[PDB]
Design a protein around this ligand. Structure first.
Ligand SMILES: CCc1nc(C(N)=O)c2nc1NC1CCN(CCOCCOc3cc(ccc3N3CCOCC3)N2)CC1
Length: 304
Protein backbone atom coordinates (compact mmCIF):
# COMPACT_ATOMS: atom_id res chain seq x y z
CA UNK A 1 0.00 0.00 0.00
CA UNK A 2 1.06 3.60 -0.72
CA UNK A 3 0.60 6.16 2.06
CA UNK A 4 -0.15 8.77 -0.63
CA UNK A 5 -3.57 8.29 -2.23
CA UNK A 6 -5.93 10.18 -4.54
CA UNK A 7 -9.48 10.87 -3.36
CA UNK A 8 -12.82 11.73 -4.96
CA UNK A 9 -15.15 13.50 -2.53
CA UNK A 10 -18.79 12.38 -2.62
CA UNK A 11 -20.43 14.91 -0.32
CA UNK A 12 -19.93 17.80 2.09
CA UNK A 13 -18.96 16.37 5.49
CA UNK A 14 -15.47 15.04 6.08
CA UNK A 15 -16.10 11.29 5.81
CA UNK A 16 -17.94 11.55 2.46
CA UNK A 17 -15.18 10.36 0.12
CA UNK A 18 -13.46 7.25 -1.25
CA UNK A 19 -10.00 6.34 -2.54
CA UNK A 20 -9.07 5.56 -6.16
CA UNK A 21 -7.79 2.15 -7.28
CA UNK A 22 -5.67 2.16 -10.44
CA UNK A 23 -5.62 -1.65 -10.75
CA UNK A 24 -8.09 -1.36 -13.66
CA UNK A 25 -6.44 1.67 -15.30
CA UNK A 26 -3.78 1.25 -17.98
CA UNK A 27 -0.12 2.14 -17.48
CA UNK A 28 1.41 4.78 -19.76
CA UNK A 29 4.39 3.27 -21.57
CA UNK A 30 6.30 6.53 -22.09
CA UNK A 31 7.71 6.17 -18.56
CA UNK A 32 9.35 2.87 -19.49
CA UNK A 33 13.11 2.68 -18.88
CA UNK A 34 15.72 0.04 -19.71
CA UNK A 35 17.68 -1.62 -16.92
CA UNK A 36 20.84 -1.26 -19.03
CA UNK A 37 21.31 2.30 -17.75
CA UNK A 38 20.83 1.60 -14.02
CA UNK A 39 24.24 1.55 -12.37
CA UNK A 40 23.65 0.77 -8.74
CA UNK A 41 24.61 2.10 -5.32
CA UNK A 42 24.23 1.13 -1.68
CA UNK A 43 21.03 0.21 0.02
CA UNK A 44 19.42 3.44 1.25
CA UNK A 45 16.50 1.91 3.19
CA UNK A 46 14.59 -1.37 3.40
CA UNK A 47 11.71 -2.36 5.64
CA UNK A 48 9.86 -5.66 5.29
CA UNK A 49 8.06 -5.27 1.95
CA UNK A 50 10.75 -3.59 -0.15
CA UNK A 51 13.77 -1.31 -0.44
CA UNK A 52 15.05 1.77 -2.25
CA UNK A 53 18.66 2.00 -3.46
CA UNK A 54 21.01 4.54 -4.95
CA UNK A 55 21.56 4.22 -8.68
CA UNK A 56 23.16 5.94 -11.66
CA UNK A 57 21.16 6.58 -14.84
CA UNK A 58 23.17 7.50 -17.93
CA UNK A 59 21.00 9.20 -20.54
CA UNK A 60 17.93 9.55 -18.32
CA UNK A 61 17.93 13.35 -18.00
CA UNK A 62 17.15 15.95 -20.67
CA UNK A 63 20.81 16.54 -21.54
CA UNK A 64 22.26 13.22 -20.42
CA UNK A 65 24.69 12.57 -17.58
CA UNK A 66 24.86 10.17 -14.65
CA UNK A 67 22.38 12.02 -12.39
CA UNK A 68 22.13 9.68 -9.40
CA UNK A 69 18.64 8.38 -8.49
CA UNK A 70 16.69 6.36 -5.94
CA UNK A 71 14.87 3.22 -7.10
CA UNK A 72 12.00 1.65 -5.14
CA UNK A 73 11.57 -2.08 -5.62
CA UNK A 74 10.27 -5.32 -4.12
CA UNK A 75 12.39 -8.05 -2.58
CA UNK A 76 9.68 -10.47 -1.36
CA UNK A 77 11.41 -13.21 -3.39
CA UNK A 78 9.21 -12.36 -6.39
CA UNK A 79 5.74 -12.01 -4.86
CA UNK A 80 2.39 -11.69 -6.66
CA UNK A 81 -0.25 -9.74 -4.69
CA UNK A 82 2.38 -7.23 -3.58
CA UNK A 83 3.53 -6.60 -7.17
CA UNK A 84 0.37 -5.21 -8.78
CA UNK A 85 -0.07 -2.98 -5.72
CA UNK A 86 3.21 -1.37 -6.77
CA UNK A 87 2.02 -1.05 -10.38
CA UNK A 88 -0.91 1.04 -9.14
CA UNK A 89 1.37 3.39 -7.21
CA UNK A 90 3.31 3.81 -10.45
CA UNK A 91 0.08 4.55 -12.32
CA UNK A 92 -0.85 7.19 -9.74
CA UNK A 93 2.57 8.85 -9.59
CA UNK A 94 2.71 9.05 -13.40
CA UNK A 95 -0.47 11.16 -13.41
CA UNK A 96 0.51 13.47 -10.54
CA UNK A 97 2.90 15.52 -12.67
CA UNK A 98 6.02 17.30 -11.45
CA UNK A 99 6.21 19.83 -8.65
CA UNK A 100 9.32 21.48 -7.27
CA UNK A 101 8.50 20.28 -3.73
CA UNK A 102 7.54 16.66 -4.49
CA UNK A 103 9.96 13.76 -4.91
CA UNK A 104 9.02 13.27 -8.55
CA UNK A 105 8.91 10.07 -10.59
CA UNK A 106 11.45 9.82 -13.42
CA UNK A 107 10.77 6.39 -14.90
CA UNK A 108 10.12 2.71 -14.31
CA UNK A 109 10.94 -0.77 -15.62
CA UNK A 110 7.79 -2.85 -16.16
CA UNK A 111 7.98 -5.88 -18.47
CA UNK A 112 11.77 -5.45 -18.15
CA UNK A 113 11.59 -8.08 -15.39
CA UNK A 114 10.96 -7.44 -11.69
CA UNK A 115 9.20 -4.12 -11.22
CA UNK A 116 11.38 -1.02 -10.74
CA UNK A 117 10.27 2.57 -10.13
CA UNK A 118 12.82 5.38 -10.42
CA UNK A 119 12.53 8.56 -8.33
CA UNK A 120 14.51 11.78 -8.01
CA UNK A 121 17.61 11.81 -5.79
CA UNK A 122 17.86 14.01 -2.69
CA UNK A 123 21.48 13.71 -1.58
CA UNK A 124 21.09 15.38 1.82
CA UNK A 125 18.59 12.82 3.14
CA UNK A 126 15.41 13.11 5.15
CA UNK A 127 14.80 16.34 7.05
CA UNK A 128 14.55 14.58 10.42
CA UNK A 129 18.11 13.24 10.24
CA UNK A 130 19.23 16.51 8.62
CA UNK A 131 17.72 18.66 11.39
CA UNK A 132 19.00 16.58 14.32
CA UNK A 133 22.48 16.45 12.77
CA UNK A 134 22.86 20.25 12.91
CA UNK A 135 21.77 20.74 16.53
CA UNK A 136 25.44 21.28 17.45
CA UNK A 137 26.15 24.10 15.11
CA UNK A 138 22.86 25.87 15.06
CA UNK A 139 23.55 29.55 14.80
CA UNK A 140 21.73 32.67 15.90
CA UNK A 141 27.28 24.48 5.70
CA UNK A 142 25.27 25.29 8.85
CA UNK A 143 21.74 26.61 8.94
CA UNK A 144 20.06 29.95 9.80
CA UNK A 145 16.51 30.54 11.02
CA UNK A 146 15.34 31.33 7.49
CA UNK A 147 16.20 27.69 6.78
CA UNK A 148 13.61 26.61 9.36
CA UNK A 149 11.20 29.04 7.69
CA UNK A 150 12.05 28.16 4.07
CA UNK A 151 11.67 24.47 4.87
CA UNK A 152 8.18 25.16 6.25
CA UNK A 153 7.16 27.18 3.18
CA UNK A 154 8.37 24.54 0.70
CA UNK A 155 6.51 21.67 2.39
CA UNK A 156 3.44 23.93 2.47
CA UNK A 157 3.38 24.73 -1.25
CA UNK A 158 4.13 21.05 -1.79
CA UNK A 159 1.07 20.00 0.21
CA UNK A 160 -0.70 22.87 -1.56
CA UNK A 161 0.13 21.07 -4.81
CA UNK A 162 -1.07 17.72 -3.47
CA UNK A 163 -4.38 19.40 -2.64
CA UNK A 164 -4.76 20.82 -6.09
CA UNK A 165 -4.37 17.39 -7.49
CA UNK A 166 -6.94 16.12 -5.14
CA UNK A 167 -4.57 13.92 -3.12
CA UNK A 168 -3.97 13.34 0.58
CA UNK A 169 -0.64 12.31 2.13
CA UNK A 170 -1.48 10.06 5.07
CA UNK A 171 2.04 10.15 6.59
CA UNK A 172 3.38 13.71 6.62
CA UNK A 173 6.37 13.87 8.98
CA UNK A 174 10.01 14.94 9.01
CA UNK A 175 11.24 11.46 8.13
CA UNK A 176 9.27 11.79 4.87
CA UNK A 177 10.68 15.18 3.81
CA UNK A 178 13.97 14.95 1.93
CA UNK A 179 16.62 17.65 1.45
CA UNK A 180 18.30 18.19 -1.92
CA UNK A 181 20.75 20.68 -3.44
CA UNK A 182 20.69 24.18 -2.00
CA UNK A 183 18.33 23.72 0.96
CA UNK A 184 15.38 22.69 -1.21
CA UNK A 185 13.15 19.95 0.17
CA UNK A 186 10.56 17.60 -1.34
CA UNK A 187 7.72 15.53 0.13
CA UNK A 188 7.97 11.79 -0.52
CA UNK A 189 6.16 8.56 0.37
CA UNK A 190 7.96 5.95 2.49
CA UNK A 191 8.97 -2.06 11.91
CA UNK A 192 11.97 -1.27 14.12
CA UNK A 193 10.83 2.36 14.47
CA UNK A 194 9.11 3.76 17.56
CA UNK A 195 6.91 6.09 15.49
CA UNK A 196 4.43 3.66 13.89
CA UNK A 197 1.86 1.65 15.81
CA UNK A 198 0.68 -1.52 14.08
CA UNK A 199 -3.08 -2.09 14.45
CA UNK A 200 -4.38 -4.77 12.10
CA UNK A 201 -2.96 -4.53 8.59
CA UNK A 202 -2.35 -0.79 9.09
CA UNK A 203 0.80 0.91 10.40
CA UNK A 204 -0.14 4.23 11.94
CA UNK A 205 2.04 7.27 12.87
CA UNK A 206 -0.05 7.97 15.94
CA UNK A 207 1.64 11.15 17.18
CA UNK A 208 1.15 12.83 13.77
CA UNK A 209 -2.48 11.76 13.26
CA UNK A 210 -5.48 14.07 13.46
CA UNK A 211 -8.22 13.02 15.93
CA UNK A 212 -10.64 12.16 13.12
CA UNK A 213 -7.93 9.76 11.89
CA UNK A 214 -7.06 8.27 15.29
CA UNK A 215 -10.69 7.55 16.13
CA UNK A 216 -12.71 7.07 12.92
CA UNK A 217 -10.18 6.51 10.12
CA UNK A 218 -11.03 9.70 8.21
CA UNK A 219 -8.20 11.13 6.09
CA UNK A 220 -8.79 14.48 4.39
CA UNK A 221 -6.73 17.37 3.10
CA UNK A 222 -7.38 19.04 6.48
CA UNK A 223 -6.06 15.97 8.31
CA UNK A 224 -2.75 16.72 6.58
CA UNK A 225 -2.89 20.25 8.00
CA UNK A 226 -2.91 18.71 11.49
CA UNK A 227 0.16 16.63 10.64
CA UNK A 228 1.73 19.71 9.05
CA UNK A 229 1.44 21.50 12.39
CA UNK A 230 3.18 18.55 14.04
CA UNK A 231 5.94 18.83 11.44
CA UNK A 232 6.07 22.55 12.15
CA UNK A 233 6.83 21.51 15.72
CA UNK A 234 9.45 19.07 14.39
CA UNK A 235 11.22 21.85 12.49
CA UNK A 236 11.28 24.50 15.23
CA UNK A 237 12.27 21.89 17.79
CA UNK A 238 15.28 20.97 15.63
CA UNK A 239 13.63 17.55 15.39
CA UNK A 240 12.65 15.93 18.69
CA UNK A 241 9.84 13.36 19.07
CA UNK A 242 6.49 15.20 19.16
CA UNK A 243 4.81 15.06 22.56
CA UNK A 244 8.26 14.32 24.04
CA UNK A 245 8.43 11.95 26.98
CA UNK A 246 4.84 10.70 26.57
CA UNK A 247 4.54 7.11 25.29
CA UNK A 248 2.02 5.96 22.70
CA UNK A 249 -0.54 4.10 24.82
CA UNK A 250 -4.22 4.24 25.75
CA UNK A 251 -3.45 7.33 27.84
CA UNK A 252 -2.19 9.10 24.72
CA UNK A 253 -5.55 8.55 23.03
CA UNK A 254 -7.32 10.17 25.99
CA UNK A 255 -4.77 12.98 25.57
CA UNK A 256 -5.69 13.92 22.02
CA UNK A 257 -9.44 13.47 22.46
CA UNK A 258 -9.41 15.79 25.49
CA UNK A 259 -7.57 18.59 23.67
CA UNK A 260 -3.85 18.24 24.41
CA UNK A 261 -1.61 20.56 22.40
CA UNK A 262 2.18 20.77 22.50
CA UNK A 263 3.98 23.80 23.89
CA UNK A 264 5.84 26.34 21.77
CA UNK A 265 9.20 24.86 20.71
CA UNK A 266 12.44 26.65 21.52
CA UNK A 267 13.33 27.94 18.04
CA UNK A 268 9.80 29.16 17.19
CA UNK A 269 8.56 32.73 17.18
CA UNK A 270 5.40 33.61 19.07
CA UNK A 271 3.82 34.17 15.65
CA UNK A 272 4.24 30.72 14.08
CA UNK A 273 3.25 29.01 17.31
CA UNK A 274 -0.21 30.49 16.74
CA UNK A 275 -0.26 28.91 13.28
CA UNK A 276 0.64 25.57 14.87
CA UNK A 277 -2.35 25.87 17.21
CA UNK A 278 -4.59 26.49 14.19
CA UNK A 279 -3.76 23.12 12.64
CA UNK A 280 -4.34 21.47 16.02
CA UNK A 281 -7.95 22.63 16.18
CA UNK A 282 -10.17 19.69 17.04
CA UNK A 283 -12.89 20.68 14.58
CA UNK A 284 -11.33 20.20 11.16
CA UNK A 285 -13.51 22.99 9.76
CA UNK A 286 -11.69 25.40 12.12
CA UNK A 287 -8.32 24.46 10.52
CA UNK A 288 -6.36 26.55 8.00
CA UNK A 289 -6.14 25.56 4.36
CA UNK A 290 -2.91 24.79 2.54
CA UNK A 291 -3.40 27.79 0.22
CA UNK A 292 -3.71 30.14 3.22
CA UNK A 293 -0.29 28.86 4.30
CA UNK A 294 1.25 30.18 1.10
CA UNK A 295 1.18 33.79 2.15
CA UNK A 296 1.23 33.37 5.96
CA UNK A 297 4.79 31.92 5.84
CA UNK A 298 6.24 32.97 2.47
CA UNK A 299 6.04 36.49 3.95
CA UNK A 300 7.52 35.63 7.36
CA UNK A 301 10.64 34.67 5.38
CA UNK A 302 10.96 37.88 3.35
CA UNK A 303 11.55 39.83 6.57
CA UNK A 304 14.56 37.63 7.42
C1 LIG B 1 11.95 6.99 -0.83
C2 LIG B 1 12.59 7.52 0.47
C3 LIG B 1 14.07 7.89 0.22
N1 LIG B 1 14.40 8.62 -0.84
C4 LIG B 1 15.68 8.95 -1.06
C5 LIG B 1 16.05 9.82 -2.28
N2 LIG B 1 15.14 9.89 -3.43
O1 LIG B 1 17.06 10.42 -2.30
C6 LIG B 1 16.68 8.51 -0.17
N3 LIG B 1 16.35 7.76 0.88
C7 LIG B 1 15.08 7.45 1.10
N4 LIG B 1 14.73 6.61 2.28
C8 LIG B 1 14.73 7.13 3.65
C9 LIG B 1 16.02 7.87 3.95
C10 LIG B 1 16.31 7.95 5.42
N5 LIG B 1 16.41 6.78 5.94
C11 LIG B 1 16.98 6.87 7.13
C12 LIG B 1 18.12 5.83 7.29
O2 LIG B 1 18.74 5.56 6.03
C13 LIG B 1 19.73 6.52 5.63
C14 LIG B 1 19.51 6.87 4.13
O3 LIG B 1 20.64 7.59 3.65
C15 LIG B 1 20.36 8.52 2.61
C16 LIG B 1 19.39 8.23 1.64
C17 LIG B 1 19.10 9.14 0.62
C18 LIG B 1 19.81 10.34 0.56
C19 LIG B 1 20.78 10.64 1.52
C20 LIG B 1 21.06 9.75 2.54
N6 LIG B 1 22.13 10.15 3.53
C21 LIG B 1 23.16 9.19 3.96
C22 LIG B 1 24.31 9.89 4.72
O4 LIG B 1 24.53 11.17 4.22
C23 LIG B 1 23.47 12.01 4.61
C24 LIG B 1 22.10 11.54 4.04
N7 LIG B 1 18.09 8.87 -0.43
C25 LIG B 1 15.19 6.23 6.06
C26 LIG B 1 14.55 5.94 4.63
Amino acid sequence: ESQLQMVQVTGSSDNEYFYVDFREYEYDLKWEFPRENLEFGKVLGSGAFGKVMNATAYGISKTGVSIQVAVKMLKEKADSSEREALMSELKMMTQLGSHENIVNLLGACTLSGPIYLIFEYCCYGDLLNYLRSKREKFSENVLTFEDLLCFAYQVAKGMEFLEFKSCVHRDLAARNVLVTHGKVVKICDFMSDSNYVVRGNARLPVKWMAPESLFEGIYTIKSDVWSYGILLWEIFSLGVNPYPGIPVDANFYKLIQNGFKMDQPFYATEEIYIIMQSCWAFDSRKRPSFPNLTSFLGCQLADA
